[PDB]
């Protein structure tokens, strides 16, 4: 007879990233199958020359989650500290989606104000998954943590 067994674990945490003058990152949150707003991980916002452009940044994945034209830069900041619908560049999202494969080009994306535990948030239908039932795969940012970086 023979019996093995192994486990192993690792953690760290720290503030030491780039300038808010190059990029900055803020709080996602998503829609569980439950249809409540569930922690997701974090939305690192890279100020480009053309446009904006975000990625996702979870507890072990990372991914472009959204991005639009230089045309938008001030727009999309708008309707993320006052709410608001603008069309963007490229929508990717989360993974385990159907635009994520490849992205959706000038996707709508209709934005709107709304508390969910004293924070202000802002919500946004994004692409159609294939994981809920017809539904748009929809999000929550802290949108007191972007006026930080948006004013």
């Not at 707003?37 to 480009?48: A, S």
């Not at 000038?106 to 994981?131: A, H, L, V």
């Amino acid at each position: 007879k023979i019996h093995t067994s192994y486990d192993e674990q690792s953690s760290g945490e720290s503030k030491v990233k780039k300038i808010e003058f190059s990029k900055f990152t803020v709080k996602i949150k998503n829609k569980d199958k439950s249809g409540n707003w569930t922690d997701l991980g974090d939305l690192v916002v890279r100020k480009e020359e053309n446009g904006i452009d975000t990625g996702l940044n979870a507890g072990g994945h990372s991914a472009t989650f959204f991005s639009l034209e230089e045309e938008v830069v001030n727009n999309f900041v708008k309707v993320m500290t006052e709410g608001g619908s603008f069309k963007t560049s490229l929508y990717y999202g989360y993974k385990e989606e159907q635009s994520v494969i490849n992205g959706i080009q000038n996707k709508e994306i209709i934005t709107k104000i709304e508390k969910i535990d004293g924070t202000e948030y802002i919500t946004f239908s994004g692409d159609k998954i294939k994981n809920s039932g017809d539904k748009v795969a929809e999000y929550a940012i802290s949108l007191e943590e972007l006026k930080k970086n948006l004013k």
